[PDB]
RNA sequence: AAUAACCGGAGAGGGAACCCACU
């Protein structure tokens, strides 16, 4: 059976943690923190798993979707100080992009926070060590029985579905990804596993994203205006992702309206992100790992590292920022710089954290914090999650048997559920954070065969004698190791047992005035006119033969009245030796 | 679902005596 417990993201978001226990292994997808938190509830609960023992005692694997840090950001703390040294999964582009990500968040940690027991840079470089690497469909044997396949997930580069499968039972993991294809990354695509467990995300799940080519369009209208219109413009958006789907669409559109103006990128990761984005072309859909023979798309001709005292420059720009979330907000202070400015604009292309200057902004109100905020703001949503249509989608071409939804609100969680039990009649659950639920298997034992007995029964049920039960018979020879269904005969031979032959022989008494010598005679004759399409053949010797069926007229008994035929028919064709008796209890023709 | 950490972050260490040579 399976045993599927959320440490984190149950009826919620961030911290993503699952634990699949299948066919008697604990394997662990995902580990990461998410923030809000900062008691050390952020990260995933230890307790349950191992309580307070070894961890590799216990688990099997880890693994990896991508590295977004809500998935990739608890590798340090759940790999070095609670020790573990197992085998982590995670493709080339997330093993190369997570260490930037988780180094970064921890000097924020130590600026902001400063938390105590926090790992160490010494300790990030330790847990990266232990990292295998994985790619596209690639089958990893994490041992002789647990094997592993990723698949291009498309949510960030390097996102990847996982398919956890033993024997029979297979249970698809697919994290966050995507089924709309953006302007770098090509959409998530699976095979036809038919798993018996898919956990999936419902971000998104209550929002049926429109258009996606349209809304650019109408991104692009807005800019191209608004640098018309000599004003500025400021992008903020978190360095990783939307970043650089943002730059490439406005690139591409600017190299072919030809304008000149120049546009700013903001430093600090963009000499990571491009540098990663370049070297790892064989992720990035068919238009870039095509277009690449010629040129390079990540080479960018008119996006330039930014200078803060620029920001002051003239005539309009444009100019993307970091972060998204504008808590620290570098973006945030050309925000203020230009605040006052009518004419400028700024697009926020994310949903902003409740509670914070984000929210502030996303409200309409002037007095933001007491400064007032005269740009005009634009809310837009380029965010690359799975909308509904998207998820049913994917659950329709896996065809699985049971759903499990994470990464989301509880309500949505409800509405998606109802829906799909609707539609696809499909089970569905909706564990909240620690609960475990269960799932009963299949676990259809498998065995051999000899070739020949499969050969002659195909033939057999080819010929048009279907629908009428040839009931497949055998005998299952069990060795404990290699169980083996062999045919009667064959077992005979293998076993060295002896073929047992049983007989039968019934005295079928004739009361009749007819003379002996003809009783064979007539027997035969009316065996060939009743029993019709039977091999009945009268031997020289006077016998009669039905099928397999011997009849003869015995010797003459003391009774003149009564004529003695012995029926012998052996126990395969006691069918029809006991038909064949029955028959002629009745008498012969007279 | 994380953000510019000075980014040419530069002061220097004996001295004391003797002889030579230039005005
Ligand atoms: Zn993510
Ligand atoms: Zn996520």
Sequence with gaps: EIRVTPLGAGQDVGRSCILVSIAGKNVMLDCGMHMGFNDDRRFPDFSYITQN??????????????????????????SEMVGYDGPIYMT?????????????????????????????????????????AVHLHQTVQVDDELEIKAYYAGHVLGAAMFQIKVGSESVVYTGDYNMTPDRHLGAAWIDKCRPNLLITESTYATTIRDSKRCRERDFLKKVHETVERGGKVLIPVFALGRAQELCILLETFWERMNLKVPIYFSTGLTEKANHYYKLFIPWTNQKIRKTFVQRNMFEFKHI??????????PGPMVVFATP??????????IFRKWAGNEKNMVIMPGYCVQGTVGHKILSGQRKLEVLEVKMQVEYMSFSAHADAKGIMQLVGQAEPESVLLVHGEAKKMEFLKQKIEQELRVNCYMPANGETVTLPT????????????????????????????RLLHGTLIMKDSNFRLVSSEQALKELGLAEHQ??????????????????????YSHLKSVLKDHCVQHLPDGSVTVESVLL???????????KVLLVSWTYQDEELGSFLTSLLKKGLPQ
């Design 53 to 78: 023992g070894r961890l590799t005692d216990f688990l099997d694997c880890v693994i990896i979707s991508h590295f977004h840090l809500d998935h990739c950001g608890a590798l340090p703390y759940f």
């Design 92 to 132: 080339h582009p997330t093993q190369a992009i997570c260490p930037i990500l988780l180094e970064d968040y921890r000097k924020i940690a130590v600026d902001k926070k400063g938390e105590a027991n926090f790992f160490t840079s010494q300790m990030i470089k330790d847990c990266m060590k232990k990292v295998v």
């Design 304 to 313: 330039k590292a930014f200078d803060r005292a620029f920001a002051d420059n």
């Design 324 to 333: 998204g979330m504008l808590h620290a907000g570098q973006s945030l202070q």
């Design 442 to 469: 299949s676990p259809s034992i498998p065995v051999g065969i000899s070739l020949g007995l499969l050969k002659r029964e195909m033939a057999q049920g080819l010929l048009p004698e279907a629908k009428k039960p």
């Design 502 to 523: 049983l007989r039968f022989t019934c005295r079928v008494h004739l009361h009749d005035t007819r003379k002996e010598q003809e009783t064979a005679l007539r027997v």
């Design 552 to 562: 003869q007229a015995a010797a003459p008994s003391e009774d003149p009245g009564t």
